[PDB]
Design a protein around this nucleic acid. Structure first.
Length: 121
RNA sequence: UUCACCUAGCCAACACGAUCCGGUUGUUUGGGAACAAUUCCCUUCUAGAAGGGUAAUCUAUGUGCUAC
């Protein structure tokens, strides 16, 4: 687990680093956010996403991790290239350069609560 | 492909694998139950006749009875 202090430069290692994404969406969505979740999953597979994501009617956040260069494209896609209406984009934290990764597969957390408890809640 | 999340609610006979045990550890030829009164008649033989017995209990599935 050698840090970037060993010899990363602009020759060949400039595109050999990992990190975490930074995004926090907020605003109303069509139906219950089904369109946004489906669109994000298809694009995420092409970029070989590892982290997870959360989608809902209003709340939309998550933690996405991957390559330093791969995540750069997603920043522009999820800021202007949005078919739905977006109010504003927030940020929580970011970090570039880290040995190995935490997650292994891309998945979206969905509300699988039973319908019986929905009325009580 | 809810690869997710707790398990006093799993197989060692699909397979890998911690420890004990080591059956020339394989092969040739066979078997692996529920149903006995023998070809019964001095009337008959190269064109049809007389006798066949374990009645012990459950679960899951096809199939039947309806008008005086």
């Amino acid at each position: 687990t050698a840090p970037r202090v060993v010899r990363d430069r602009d020759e060949t290692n400039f595109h050999e680093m990992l990190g975490k994404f930074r995004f926090d969406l907020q605003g109303s969505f069509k139906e219950n956010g089904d369109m946004l979740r489906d669109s994000l999953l298809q694009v995420g597979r092409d970029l070989f996403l590892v982290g997870w994501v959360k989608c809902r009617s209003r709340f939309a956040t998550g933690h996405i991790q991957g390559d330093v260069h791969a995540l750069s494209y997603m920043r522009r896609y999820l800021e202007k290239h949005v078919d739905e209406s977006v109010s504003s984009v927030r940020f929580y934290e970011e970090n570039f350069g880290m040995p190995l990764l935490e997650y292994e597969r891309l998945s979206a957390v969905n509300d699988f609560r039973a319908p019986g408890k929905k009325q009580q809640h």
